Design a protein around this ligand. Structure first.
Ligand SMILES: c1coc(CNc2ncnc3nc[nH]c23)c1
Length: 159
């Protein structure tokens, strides 16, 4: 079955720039700005569009060793990015996939709002716990804040 979770968060960075950095250049930025959260990102197959597979490794001591994520869609006009967790970590006999959608929207103050949906696809019917969703949110927020801090400090990056 599918369990749907939605959240929203804000950024002080304008949408297009935040999209170029946090979404389009995450493979590079995440291990650089948040090494305590992401040890490395490996491109396994594909050139960045639908179907591209990445292996994201976590630091020692984390609950999981890695996940493989697959790019589902990338909308460079409307700042939408869809990707799925397809192997590793929580994926296995109870959880087939996590499908995610991120949309970044401009706000008139010059920042942005990120709208995030996480859909957990379980085998038949087993149950997703608030704890697993929380952990995802916390990771996403750590990464956002680390990227935001970098973009604040490096004005010539991603313009
Ligand atoms: C690429 C990898 O992770 C992201 C961020 N998605 C995201 N950001 C902030 N909180 C989240 N919660 C679930 N997904 C989230 C983009």
């Amino acid at each position: 079955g599918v369990f749907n979770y939605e959240t929203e968060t804000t950024s002080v960075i304008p949408a297009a720039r935040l999209f170029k950095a946090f979404i389009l250049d995450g493979d590079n930025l995440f291990p650089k700005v948040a090494p305590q959260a992401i040890s490395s990102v490996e491109n396994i197959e594909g050139n960045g569009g639908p179907g591209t597979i990445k292996k994201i490794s976590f630091p020692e001591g984390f609950p999981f060793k890695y996940v493989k994520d697959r790019v589902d869609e990338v909308d460079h006009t409307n700042f939408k990015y869809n990707y799925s967790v397809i192997e590793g970590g929580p994926i296995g006999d109870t959880l087939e996939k996590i499908s995610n959608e991120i949309k970044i929207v401009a706000t008139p103050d010059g920042g942005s709002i990120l709208k995030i949906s996480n859909k957990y696809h379980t085998k038949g019917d087993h149950e997703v716990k608030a704890e697993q969703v929380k952990a995802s949110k916390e990771m996403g927020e750590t990464l956002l804040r680390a990227v935001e801090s970098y973009l604040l400090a490096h004005s010539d990056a991603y313009n």
